[PDB]
């Protein structure tokens, strides 16, 4: 599905806006060095310019959305990114030899600093064929991105990978197809290695059968895991139109669906999908803003742009959640 694939352009636009303004990198929360903080910005800037070489249409969409980004949206992107990263980093620090599987990775570049930071990390990026082909093109065309992953300019990887370069793999898969998915995982991961699974704005685009089988199958496949999921929720308090409005706005405007947004309309309902894991934690992103962001960071962000409407930020961010499920 082209339309589902193109939701990544929004995610990338948001990432680039946050970096351009300076919300990210957050060197404390993302545990970046002086050099990697610089590279973080450089890598993303290069991605954008390289995207332009490969697609006028995609660049246009990203470019226009990124320059029109509002502060409330930038705070969202910041919270989403440092929330996920904080969870990843705690686990990688504790477990030196680990494998990360990023499900529906789109244009995500968090592997670039992570692979440098953690010598025994192995990382697998998975998305639809058309999406990974574009990412592969970009990563190999840009000199600084090539250097960051040790890539040849040429496509030297053999099916089933587009990149198969040591501790990093990029592979096409339709994650609605569990047989394809398990066959892929069988040749790029091992059962016994501690595993982080990432689903950042992936599961919201799936029907419940597909998302549940994906969760159940992948938790069954690895002995020792942490699943970090980020997604919107419809909202549970009465007279909360957020979910209804979002679904209507997405169908009307873009012919896009979020099939379980109203089903899993609270953080509790959402987290229940991982109830086979013994250790499940869920917070909305306002809770993250108030309890996990240090005061030093709130002050920094206040220096970048005016957030004139803090309540509006709250109303939005209570509709995004970060779920951490751990099993062994
Ligand atoms: C909103 S984007 C998020 C991308 C990235 N995780 C991020 O947060 O920046 C959703 C991504 O999930 C991918 N996706 C959705 N359904 C998929 C499926 N059935 N198989 C593989 N990828 C899928 C899309 O192609 C897209 O790149």
Swiss-Prot record:
InterPro entries: LCMT1 (IPR016651), Ppm1/Ppm2/Tcmp (IPR007213), SAM-dependent_MTases_sf (IPR029063)
Activity regulation description: Inhibited by S-adenosyl-L-homocysteine.
Pfam families: LCM
Enzyme Commission (EC) number: 2.1.1.233
GO biological process, one term: regulation of autophagy
Key word Acyltransferase present: no
GO terms for MF: protein C-terminal leucine carboxyl O-methyltransferase activity
Catalytic activity from the UniProt record: [phosphatase 2A protein]-C-terminal L-leucine + S-adenosyl-L-methionine = [phosphatase 2A protein]-C-terminal L-leucine methyl ester + S-adenosyl-L-homocysteine
Superkingdom, natural source: Eukaryota
Keyword Methyltransferase: yes
Keywords: Methyltransferase, S-adenosyl-L-methionine, Transferase
Residues where S-adenosyl-L-methionine binds: 80, 104, 127, 174-176, 200
PANTHER family named in the record: LEUCINE CARBOXYL METHYLTRANSFERASE, LEUCINE CARBOXYL METHYLTRANSFERASE 1
Family under the similarity heading: Belongs to the methyltransferase superfamily. LCMT family.
Function: Methylates the carboxyl group of the C-terminal leucine residue of protein phosphatase 2A catalytic subunits to form alpha-leucine ester residues. Acts on the two major protein phosphatase 2A catalytic subunits, PPH21 and PPH22.
Identification of the protein by name: Leucine carboxyl methyltransferase 1
Organism: Saccharomyces cerevisiae (strain ATCC 204508 / S288c)
Name of the gene this protein is made from: PPM1
